[PDB]
Write an enzyme that holds these catalytic residues in place. Structure first.
Site, PDB file in Angstrom:
ATOM      1  N   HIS A  72     -38.825   3.133  -5.820  1.00 47.16           N
ATOM      2  CA  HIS A  72     -38.263   1.799  -5.923  1.00 47.16           C
ATOM      3  C   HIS A  72     -39.152   0.845  -6.710  1.00 47.16           C
ATOM      4  O   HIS A  72     -40.385   0.939  -6.670  1.00 47.16           O
ATOM      5  CB  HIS A  72     -38.044   1.214  -4.526  1.00 47.16           C
ATOM      6  CG  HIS A  72     -39.311   0.993  -3.761  1.00 47.16           C
ATOM      7  ND1 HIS A  72     -39.859   1.948  -2.932  1.00 47.16           N
ATOM      8  CD2 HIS A  72     -40.148  -0.070  -3.715  1.00 47.16           C
ATOM      9  CE1 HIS A  72     -40.978   1.480  -2.407  1.00 47.16           C
ATOM     10  NE2 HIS A  72     -41.177   0.258  -2.866  1.00 47.16           N
ATOM     11  N   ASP A  73     -38.510  -0.073  -7.424  1.00 50.54           N
ATOM     12  CA  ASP A  73     -39.201  -1.103  -8.196  1.00 50.54           C
ATOM     13  C   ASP A  73     -40.066  -0.654  -9.372  1.00 50.54           C
ATOM     14  O   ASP A  73     -40.897  -1.422  -9.855  1.00 50.54           O
ATOM     15  CB  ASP A  73     -40.038  -1.962  -7.246  1.00 50.54           C
ATOM     16  CG  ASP A  73     -39.200  -2.605  -6.161  1.00 50.54           C
ATOM     17  OD1 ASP A  73     -38.316  -3.425  -6.491  1.00 50.54           O
ATOM     18  OD2 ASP A  73     -39.412  -2.288  -4.975  1.00 50.54           O
TER      19      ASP A  73
ATOM     20  N   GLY B  63     -44.150   3.275  -5.508  1.00 51.28           N
ATOM     21  CA  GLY B  63     -43.443   2.046  -5.822  1.00 51.28           C
ATOM     22  C   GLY B  63     -44.136   1.028  -6.709  1.00 51.28           C
ATOM     23  O   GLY B  63     -45.356   1.037  -6.861  1.00 51.28           O
TER      24      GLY B  63
END
Ligand SMILES: CCCCCCCCS[C@@H]1O[C@H](CO)[C@@H](O)[C@H](O)[C@H]1O
Ligand SMILES: CCCCCCCCS[C@@H]1O[C@H](CO)[C@@H](O)[C@H](O)[C@H]1O
Ligand SMILES: CCCCCCCCS[C@@H]1O[C@H](CO)[C@@H](O)[C@H](O)[C@H]1O
Lengths: 259, 259, 259
Positions: free
Chosen positions: C120-121, C138
């Site tokens: 994520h991100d 992340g």
């Protein structure tokens, strides 16, 4: 509370109420899914596998296929998974063998990230976290509150006690006593899992443990001899019992410390 | 002897008798499955792929998709798999390229555990075992009776001779002569695969090999010069021929020894 | 221009013209596929995911499922993929989080080999290549023309600038300035990505960069102080601006050099 019409589910499998099954799941005749279980699309469940309440399994995970071990001979074994578990994409978990404990066991509230493999006869407790690509060989025992960093390989028969932390990319071939942090190719103990102890243990006991390990890992008397003496000088102390009995029961031996 | 109705099978594929195909398998128009082949659910077979008698392939394995190599240009290549093979979950095997040998070849009675990737133009013999996550780059040659530990990466053009053992988590960038054990990030030879030699070779010959390698790996004369001399002083000795000719044919060079 | 009848496609998903969808693909209600996208069989697309023109995704890839991160709470995030990308088998890519940048972004003309995980991100640019099993934690930022070798793990918040090369099996915990080559468990800078600079940069500028880094990595003045001084003595020089501003913006700190 929806079961995809495209999913293939053996009429012999037992599916409790509230179970969600995504598109194209394949469920064998020895599977059992307790209440609230959620299977995303394409989950494969074979063998004598039980999946506890509210456990959620992501796409392309494979649970219950026969162990990779050659010694296996179409034996009668099981895979038992607890409640509130999160099992991510591409995980592969096999049931036990007759030579082992005839089962692979996983407790509650664990998170097994993607590409995690749990070999036959392994035992995982509760509140554990296994990061991406963790690879467990056969007959491994993992206590509660254990964190294992990504791409770490644990060799056969290794035992990791409660509250341990294992850094990513490690290769562990020895047992790890409670509340210890491990790291390194040929992994060794680098200290205590302070962050974990602080949430589960009281300050006084945390100090006691540090002291305990400092005395246990002295060079002269063997670890075993110090452990036995520790049980004598403290016949009444849960931490000594938990730590020392673990040590004396070690098969592969205890991991290297730093003193 | 059952073919799942949900499986997608090109009418151009050739499926021999006794073949088992699990739910949702995807079989392309250039695939051939010999007698007794068993595909679990969700196996993907694409390209010009041949799967030999009695080979069994587990869920979510992908065989025959185009090589990852950029040089590839929709070339006409093949993937040829032998008999009695065991190919586990999440394996990914590509066919060859025009720049290579136009094919990826795998022999008989091999076990490729989960997450194993075999790149384009690789050649694997028989009785081999590749553990979890083994990654083979392109143009690799692996002889018979080779064991490669989990999470090991083999670089392009590397050649591993018969009876070798490679420890897990290794990174091999050089060739390995017959009956040697290798280990380490930048992998090197740590000795001989005694356990393997003991089942395939007679004691007398095992001693001869030890001696041979001890002389071959002396520091002064180069390995190449010692190999050539070895072929002269023993024009009639299968082991010398097998070992020394392998060495003289090396492209990436032979791995480091210990003397 | 064919969509398999067995594929499950939400009526709410937006599928542009010329899109190819293989057998058994699973496409959620928040997915968007731009022109010319090609999905092989069994691709899973969930969440608010956009896949750019001509991108091709191979079997068993999973894009858009929720991040593994525990902090995530059914947040509203996206996964945005650019044009002409090649995403291989078993890749797993998650969308962003509210605590991050609410999205995971991937540019154009990238190749993500099998078993690659993008957390994520993360932000990936264009013309990048991530080899087998690369694992991104992340909040990672990767510039254009970056190559990351197989089985490499990049830790959270790490930033890799344009034109960098990271050797396989590395573990990177720090930022890498433009045009640098990195390698090692606890990865460090081993020099410059000459091969890359030679195709994107003119000889004169390549020399300037070498000199720049040699002065930047001197032991006495801190890297930060040298960077600031470099911006003063060369207020007008794109390379100094690109390199030094990157350095001064570092959160995890810049990787180790060699001087
Ligand atoms: C220090 C020496 C350590 C030796 C460890 C040997 C582990 C072999 S076990 C093997 O592990 C695989 C994990 O992928 C499982 O799939 C197989 O079924 C199981 O048989
Ligand atoms: C010591 C230097 C070693 C350099 C090794 C380079 C290997 C690049 S090959 C590459 O390997 C991948 C394996 O995943 C395959 O998928 C690709 O198709 C193939 O092109
Ligand atoms: C030097 C210390 C480095 C610490 C790095 C911590 C990275 C944890 S992040 C974690 O990474 C996973 C990658 O698999 C993602 O899937 C998870 O969602 C994400 O939360």
């Amino acid at each position: 509370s929806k079961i995809a019409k495209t999913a293939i589910i053996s009429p012999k499998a037992e599916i409790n109420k509230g179970v969600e099954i995504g598109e194209f799941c394949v469920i064998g005749d020895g599977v059992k899914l307790d209440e609230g279980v959620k299977l995303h699309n394409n989950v494969t469940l074979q063998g004598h596998t039980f999946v506890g309440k509210n456990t959620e399994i992501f796409p392309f995970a494979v649970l219950g296929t026969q162990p990779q071990d050659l010694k296996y001979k179409g034996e009668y074994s099981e895979l038992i998974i607890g409640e509130d578990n999160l099992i991510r994409e591409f995980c592969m978990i096999n049931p036990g063998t007759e030579g082992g404990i005839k089962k692979t066991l996983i407790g509650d509230k664990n998170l097994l990230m993607a590409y995690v493999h749990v070999a036959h006869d392994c035992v995982i407790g509760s509140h554990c976290i296994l990061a991406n690509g963790v690879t467990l060989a056969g007959h491994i025992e993992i206590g509660d509150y254990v964190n294992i960093g990504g791409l770490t390989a644990i060799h056969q028969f290794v035992r990791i006690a409660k509250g341990c932390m294992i850094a990513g990319k490690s290769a562990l071939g020895k047992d790890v006593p409670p509340y210890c942090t491990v790291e390194g190719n040929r992994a060794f103990i680098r200290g205590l899992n302070r962050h974990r102890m602080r949430q589960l243990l009281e300050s006084k006991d945390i100090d006691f443990i540090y002291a305990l390990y400092k005395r246990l890992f002295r060079p002269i008397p063997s670890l075993r001899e110090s452990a036995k003496l520790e049980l004598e000088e403290h016949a009444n102390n849960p931490f000594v019992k938990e730590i020392c009995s673990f040590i004396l029961e070690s098969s592969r031996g205890v991991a290297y410390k730093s003193s």
